[PDB]
């Protein structure tokens, strides 16, 4: 960082030297007309080199030595340490005419050495290191370095219906715990030389991205000032003498999205005062880079924490019930809500994603899932209309996977869609852009649009098989149901009847025979099986799965007027997964040996593994038990900043 | 690329096999109830493996061999070559009950092998290679591969006031020369099996990005069809038997900009017909990636081609004069216009950038610089108002440079600006975003706003010093002018007078003495010298320049009511550079030895090098000779796709 300084004719120039920089000094222009030579004298803590076209001769404090004047011959001035006083560090050059040994005129430089560094934590250990070279850049990888910033999606004070990032005001003292520290460190004399001031500033573009607070009068009357943020581009810092540190707290307002990479910057600058109606000059500038931590989903293979359910009709973790007024006739806590988390070094908390769907429970998250160490976010489309695929039963995430040499440690977000040439339903562009812009989990689009509801959770699920790993992707199969039913028919059970209890029940008698003897049905389910196999191909491709990794659960579908599938009997891939111990819907299949053959079948599949199956009663609404419940999960041990997406 | 195929119970399934893929075939679901075993028979060109949980046993054409039925035991079907007929490649599986050696039922797969590849040139040699693996990706670097696409910024037919990319219609046959070739290559039987069709498609987002034409009835009535583009998302391709190729031409509509990376994609897909009111199924998809070639500026160190001038008052390359009606009272051909070029492998041409400034000559480029092999582009701000910094005298470009290990082969675009905290003038966001999004030349912002006009060309220029390299950045210096004037004063010439001819002339006598004796002036020019030194620091930093690379030309400025600089005498860094041989403005300085001391000074500087100086008369307008002329230049020999920005 080389800065240009020129002496003035017959005059003494006062200047501020910022450590970490070197001065190129021009002694030629200040030379009087007729002077053929120059000698120089300088202070102890000032290093002076005489540079003629690249060759630098370091010179003593008292020169008593002359050089030939020339534009090529110049000075290089460096300073080792900060100044105790505004002066006493100087470089004085005397000029000589060839006819005498006495100087004619002389020029000088009065140096005031200060050290200004804007510091953040770029090595991600949870404390702030002094002047990290990499602080102005952001690098992915375990050996990579950069500062990380959390959004405040949460609420310290219940008195308001908003996240803490929503205002420019800070109320509670615990707020700052979520903010990332930025310290301005300074070394210099008792005060600054006249016409100099230090200023913090951010872009107009970064106004809504960040905010920066300073805490004044700690204990006592303690107050939180908003120095940077919305409507504040700059703040003028008060300089304090000697070694001094100014502690600031930074908060991300916005999440990484379309048009926003997640990267933000804050600058500090030393401004020299020129004159009225003229801009201050940025003598020196230091810069730090924050990256706003993304939003990360939790798959079904992670340890569960909380289980949520709407209300109602009628193990080793808690259950949060959504009652009455909160329900407002909306039975789906799955579709409206996706659980996630955000993390920084030694900082982080759960964050919830609220669906644009805006069911009668739309009011519920904020009022409230939202509170201390619990986050909230939304994307509401303006020009686009909401469909059934924007429900979060259509939003899932895969276990950590490896696809052809590339690692996906946090898994891959799976969302349902339609063929591009179909012209069918799709998730809103805002949500897709959001998830895509999170970019750590690298979203994929399956095909859910052959289903009436259009959700991913209908045809697939993941369960842990406590190696602990490998997660055994479970898919629906109509083929398996027809196979099982044909086997039971050949066993003499073809007259056995589905839907014991309920209705008809046996008044309308639906038997394995009459089901297998249904033509339109078997055609429909052949087509549906194709629809399943396409998704199977996508999953195997993009998730790097073999055929060894898949289990086909018996399922049956029925085609509606839209040529879409609705569950013939309750969908069993619609289950919920807690640490093995499956929540599978009760299929209500036909009875063999006084037992439902479907239950015994899926047991015969999963039970040889650690999985313990449990069957829940529900289906005309229509959805099974995924649509009725949502489970909060414990995050990955893997830190997202160690990736290379 | 593994695709899922299932046999149907007691039935023969017909299917299309696309080469480069392998089929996972399920024989378990199609098995009749009670069958304990299965044997298989298959054609010669069909390879069949029996896979039980990862162990694959390749089997002969006539098996006469039974395996135990099981969900784990499955088939792997591959095909080596395309089919001569829709059938005669098949796999038939017979099922056996344990009580007999005669098959009970059987299932089958009738394979039709076709080969579909969408091909482009990803290795950039100028011809289209067969199925480049890297065609679906775009990589920077000499060893990197990807397809390159030119925008059509030019006009084949003069009858219309628009570039060729502006419509969906193609008229002239030479148009296609600028387009990039994309060939669909096919191998198969005389026709396609029933319920199958091939479709080309692009995104709705890519509608305005690209266009794709097919040429039908060559010679003869030869017609150009627009298959893909604005308002056309898809086109249904006619399948031709045997080895067949369909040639398409692609044209970029839009340049890389804000919100557009420059990358576009075109897909081909094999669709299977399902049924009415149901979407066709994408059995197979191939994808190619084009990147639209950026727009690249030419520095002053490149060989010149054409020289442009407005009109009027009053070597070894031509001169294009802009007359009268075209002028419309606008004397600046520099501010309105920036010359550039675009290139693909074995394709390319000059492209002009038209300023949002919209001077009276705003009409001129299109009407016309625009024609065959000459391009045109514009960025017109909507919400933002134009200033003097949007003129292209404020838009320049550096020679190829190396900054701390990083190479900038095409140079770096230099544009003037103001301090962020000033609140002063700046270039419109649209143009800045454009240049930034070109991204190969990595734009930098100097500080031009201390100048009244606010242009970069005022304080700096580059000239070749025929090593050939190193380009000697020339900067304005008030200090050098004051030094020279003081020397001349001490020589007894202090009574010599500037502006011979003109006015006053000597009636108002402006002498070296009276100039040096001016206080306010010397203060103003000290400040201006600081303004020069800041830019000097920026250039040295970002261009990786030493102090050896700079020459300070004598200059003098005067502060207006805006506290900005206007030339005291004509600005000499405002010159034009053709292959040495400088176009420097005539300074009209004071006379020594019957010669202008400034001319002799800058000669004394530059003439020791290959540069041959020539002085042009002009200044009250105000600008010198850069503002009055613009030179078109020969491009780099360096291909932009070999970079790593
Ligand atoms: Ca707040
Ligand atoms: Ca908070
Ligand atoms: Ca909502
Ligand atoms: Ca908190
Ligand atoms: Ca979900
Ligand atoms: Ca056209
Ligand atoms: Ca054209
Ligand atoms: Ca224009
Ligand atoms: Ca052309
Ligand atoms: Ca220019």
Coordinates of N, CA and C in Angstrom, one line a residue, chain A residues 2-4 6 8-9 24 28-29 31-34 53-54 201 271-272 274 276-283 419-422 447 477 479 483 486-487 490 526-527 529-530 533-534 536-537 540 547-548 552 559 563, chain B residues 2-4 6 8-9 24 28-29 31-34 53-54 201 271-272 274 276-283 419-422 447 477 479 483 486-487 490 526-527 529-530 533-534 536-537 540 547-548 552 559 563:
Chain A
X2 N 1.2 1.7 -1.2 CA 2.1 2.9 -1.3 C 1.3 4.1 -1.6
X3 N 1.5 5.2 -0.8 CA 0.8 6.4 -0.9 C 1.7 7.6 -1.3
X4 N 1.2 8.5 -2.2 CA 2.0 9.5 -2.7 C 2.0 10.8 -1.9
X6 N 4.0 14.7 -1.6 CA 4.9 15.7 -2.2 C 5.2 16.8 -1.2
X8 N 6.3 20.7 -0.5 CA 5.8 22.0 -1.1 C 7.0 23.0 -1.1
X9 N 7.0 23.8 -2.2 CA 8.1 24.7 -2.4 C 8.3 25.6 -1.2
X24 N 5.7 7.4 -0.9 CA 6.6 7.8 -2.0 C 6.7 9.3 -1.9
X28 N 11.7 16.6 -5.7 CA 12.2 17.3 -6.9 C 11.4 18.6 -7.2
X29 N 10.1 18.5 -7.1 CA 9.2 19.6 -7.4 C 9.3 20.8 -6.4
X31 N 12.1 21.6 -5.0 CA 13.4 22.2 -5.2 C 13.4 23.6 -5.8
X32 N 14.1 24.6 -5.2 CA 14.2 25.9 -5.8 C 14.9 25.9 -7.1
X33 N 14.6 26.9 -8.0 CA 15.3 27.0 -9.3 C 16.8 27.3 -9.1
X34 N 17.6 26.4 -9.6 CA 19.0 26.6 -9.6 C 19.8 25.7 -8.6
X53 N 15.5 5.4 -9.6 CA 15.1 4.4 -10.6 C 15.2 2.9 -10.1
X54 N 14.7 2.6 -8.9 CA 14.7 1.3 -8.4 C 15.7 0.9 -7.4
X201 N -18.4 3.8 7.4 CA -19.4 3.9 6.4 C -19.7 2.6 5.6
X271 N -10.3 10.5 7.0 CA -10.6 11.7 6.2 C -9.9 12.9 6.6
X272 N -9.2 13.5 5.6 CA -8.5 14.8 5.7 C -9.4 15.9 5.3
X274 N -10.3 19.3 3.7 CA -9.7 20.2 2.7 C -10.1 21.6 2.8
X276 N -14.2 24.2 2.9 CA -15.6 24.3 2.8 C -16.1 24.0 1.4
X277 N -17.3 23.3 1.3 CA -17.9 23.0 0.0 C -17.0 22.1 -0.8
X278 N -16.1 21.3 -0.1 CA -15.2 20.4 -0.8 C -15.2 19.1 0.0
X279 N -15.2 17.9 -0.7 CA -15.2 16.6 0.0 C -14.0 16.3 0.8
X280 N -14.2 15.7 1.9 CA -13.1 15.2 2.8 C -12.3 14.1 2.0
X281 N -11.0 14.0 2.1 CA -10.2 13.1 1.3 C -9.9 11.8 2.1
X282 N -10.2 10.6 1.5 CA -10.0 9.3 2.1 C -8.5 9.0 2.0
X283 N -7.7 9.6 3.0 CA -6.3 9.3 3.1 C -6.0 7.8 3.3
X419 N -43.1 -31.2 -15.2 CA -42.3 -31.2 -16.4 C -42.3 -29.8 -16.9
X420 N -41.2 -29.3 -17.4 CA -41.1 -27.9 -17.9 C -42.1 -27.7 -19.1
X421 N -42.3 -28.7 -19.9 CA -43.2 -28.7 -21.0 C -44.7 -29.0 -20.7
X422 N -44.9 -29.3 -19.5 CA -46.3 -29.6 -19.0 C -47.2 -28.4 -19.0
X447 N -40.6 -34.7 -9.4 CA -41.9 -34.5 -10.1 C -43.0 -34.9 -9.1
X477 N -44.7 -47.9 -3.7 CA -44.8 -48.7 -4.9 C -46.2 -49.3 -5.0
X479 N -46.8 -51.3 -7.6 CA -46.4 -52.7 -8.0 C -46.2 -53.6 -6.9
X483 N -48.5 -56.9 -6.2 CA -47.8 -58.2 -6.0 C -48.2 -58.9 -4.7
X486 N -51.7 -60.1 -5.0 CA -51.8 -61.3 -5.9 C -51.4 -62.5 -5.1
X487 N -50.3 -62.4 -4.3 CA -49.8 -63.4 -3.5 C -50.9 -63.8 -2.4
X490 N -53.7 -65.7 -4.1 CA -53.3 -67.1 -4.4 C -53.2 -67.9 -3.1
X526 N -50.3 -48.4 -12.9 CA -49.2 -48.7 -13.7 C -48.6 -47.3 -14.1
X527 N -49.4 -46.4 -14.6 CA -49.0 -45.1 -14.9 C -48.4 -44.4 -13.7
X529 N -47.0 -45.8 -11.2 CA -45.8 -46.5 -10.9 C -44.7 -46.0 -11.8
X530 N -45.0 -45.6 -13.0 CA -44.1 -44.9 -13.9 C -43.7 -43.6 -13.3
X533 N -41.2 -44.2 -10.7 CA -40.0 -44.6 -11.3 C -39.1 -43.4 -11.8
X534 N -39.8 -42.4 -12.4 CA -39.1 -41.2 -12.9 C -38.4 -40.5 -11.7
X536 N -37.7 -41.9 -9.0 CA -36.6 -42.9 -8.5 C -35.3 -42.6 -9.3
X537 N -35.5 -42.4 -10.6 CA -34.3 -42.1 -11.4 C -33.7 -40.8 -11.0
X540 N -31.9 -41.3 -7.6 CA -30.7 -42.1 -7.7 C -29.6 -41.3 -8.4
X547 N -29.4 -48.9 -6.1 CA -30.7 -49.6 -5.9 C -30.7 -50.3 -4.6
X548 N -29.5 -50.5 -4.0 CA -29.4 -51.1 -2.7 C -29.9 -50.1 -1.6
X552 N -39.1 -50.2 -1.4 CA -40.4 -49.9 -2.0 C -41.5 -50.4 -1.1
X559 N -57.0 -42.2 -9.6 CA -56.9 -41.0 -10.5 C -58.2 -40.2 -10.4
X563 N -56.6 -36.0 -13.6 CA -55.6 -37.1 -14.0 C -54.5 -37.1 -13.0
Chain B
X2 N -28.6 -44.1 -15.3 CA -29.4 -45.3 -15.1 C -30.9 -45.0 -15.1
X3 N -31.7 -45.7 -16.0 CA -33.1 -45.4 -16.1 C -33.9 -46.6 -15.6
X4 N -35.0 -46.4 -15.0 CA -35.8 -47.5 -14.4 C -36.9 -48.0 -15.4
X6 N -39.7 -51.4 -15.7 CA -40.4 -52.5 -15.1 C -41.2 -53.3 -16.1
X8 N -44.3 -55.8 -17.1 CA -45.7 -55.8 -16.6 C -46.2 -57.2 -16.5
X9 N -47.1 -57.5 -15.6 CA -47.6 -58.8 -15.3 C -48.2 -59.4 -16.6
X24 N -32.2 -50.3 -15.5 CA -32.4 -51.2 -14.4 C -33.8 -51.8 -14.5
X28 N -39.3 -58.8 -10.8 CA -40.0 -59.4 -9.6 C -41.5 -59.1 -9.6
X29 N -41.8 -57.9 -9.9 CA -43.2 -57.4 -9.8 C -44.1 -58.1 -10.8
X31 N -43.8 -61.1 -11.9 CA -43.8 -62.5 -11.6 C -45.2 -62.9 -11.1
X32 N -45.8 -64.0 -11.7 CA -47.1 -64.5 -11.3 C -47.0 -65.0 -9.8
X33 N -48.1 -65.1 -9.1 CA -48.1 -65.6 -7.8 C -47.8 -67.1 -7.8
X34 N -46.8 -67.5 -7.0 CA -46.5 -68.9 -6.9 C -45.2 -69.3 -7.7
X53 N -28.1 -57.9 -5.3 CA -27.5 -57.0 -4.4 C -26.0 -56.6 -4.7
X54 N -25.8 -56.2 -5.9 CA -24.5 -55.7 -6.3 C -23.6 -56.6 -7.1
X201 N -36.3 -27.5 -26.6 CA -36.9 -26.5 -25.8 C -35.9 -25.7 -25.0
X271 N -39.7 -37.4 -25.8 CA -41.0 -37.4 -25.1 C -41.8 -38.7 -25.5
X272 N -42.3 -39.4 -24.5 CA -43.2 -40.5 -24.7 C -44.6 -40.0 -24.4
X274 N -48.3 -40.4 -23.3 CA -49.0 -41.1 -22.3 C -50.5 -41.3 -22.7
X276 N -54.3 -38.5 -23.5 CA -54.9 -37.1 -23.7 C -55.0 -36.4 -22.3
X277 N -54.8 -35.1 -22.3 CA -54.9 -34.3 -21.1 C -53.8 -34.7 -20.1
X278 N -52.8 -35.4 -20.6 CA -51.7 -35.8 -19.7 C -50.3 -35.4 -20.4
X279 N -49.4 -34.9 -19.6 CA -48.1 -34.4 -20.1 C -47.2 -35.6 -20.7
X280 N -46.5 -35.3 -21.8 CA -45.6 -36.2 -22.4 C -44.4 -36.4 -21.4
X281 N -43.9 -37.6 -21.4 CA -42.8 -37.9 -20.4 C -41.4 -37.8 -21.0
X282 N -40.6 -37.0 -20.3 CA -39.2 -36.8 -20.8 C -38.3 -38.0 -20.5
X283 N -38.5 -39.1 -21.3 CA -37.7 -40.3 -21.3 C -36.2 -40.0 -21.3
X419 N -15.8 10.4 -4.5 CA -15.7 9.7 -3.2 C -17.1 9.3 -2.8
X420 N -17.2 8.1 -2.2 CA -18.5 7.6 -1.8 C -19.2 8.5 -0.8
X421 N -18.4 9.2 0.0 CA -19.0 10.1 1.0 C -19.2 11.5 0.5
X422 N -18.8 11.8 -0.7 CA -18.9 13.1 -1.3 C -20.4 13.4 -1.6
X447 N -10.9 8.8 -9.5 CA -11.6 9.9 -9.1 C -11.5 11.0 -10.1
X477 N 0.6 16.9 -14.4 CA 1.3 17.5 -13.2 C 1.2 19.0 -13.2
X479 N 2.6 20.4 -10.6 CA 3.9 20.6 -10.0 C 5.0 20.8 -11.0
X483 N 7.3 23.9 -11.7 CA 8.8 23.7 -11.6 C 9.4 24.3 -12.9
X486 N 9.3 28.0 -13.0 CA 10.2 28.6 -12.1 C 11.6 28.6 -12.6
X487 N 12.0 27.5 -13.3 CA 13.3 27.4 -14.0 C 13.4 28.4 -15.1
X490 N 13.9 31.8 -13.6 CA 15.3 32.0 -13.1 C 16.3 32.1 -14.3
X526 N -2.1 23.2 -6.1 CA -1.6 22.3 -5.1 C -2.6 21.3 -4.8
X527 N -3.9 21.8 -4.5 CA -5.0 20.9 -4.3 C -5.2 19.9 -5.5
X529 N -3.1 19.0 -7.6 CA -2.0 18.1 -7.6 C -2.2 16.9 -6.7
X530 N -2.8 17.2 -5.5 CA -3.3 16.2 -4.6 C -4.3 15.3 -5.3
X533 N -2.5 13.0 -7.4 CA -1.7 12.0 -6.7 C -2.6 10.9 -6.1
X534 N -3.8 11.2 -5.7 CA -4.8 10.2 -5.3 C -5.0 9.1 -6.4
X536 N -3.1 8.7 -8.9 CA -1.8 8.1 -9.1 C -1.7 6.8 -8.2
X537 N -2.1 7.0 -6.9 CA -2.0 5.9 -5.9 C -3.0 4.8 -6.4
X540 N -1.4 3.0 -9.5 CA -0.3 2.2 -9.1 C -0.7 0.9 -8.4
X547 N 6.7 3.4 -9.9 CA 6.9 4.8 -10.2 C 7.8 4.9 -11.4
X548 N 8.4 3.8 -11.8 CA 9.2 3.8 -13.1 C 8.3 3.9 -14.3
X552 N 5.2 12.3 -15.8 CA 4.3 13.5 -15.4 C 4.4 14.6 -16.4
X559 N -9.8 26.7 -10.8 CA -10.9 26.3 -10.1 C -12.2 27.2 -10.4
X563 N -15.9 24.5 -7.5 CA -14.6 24.0 -6.9 C -14.1 22.8 -7.7

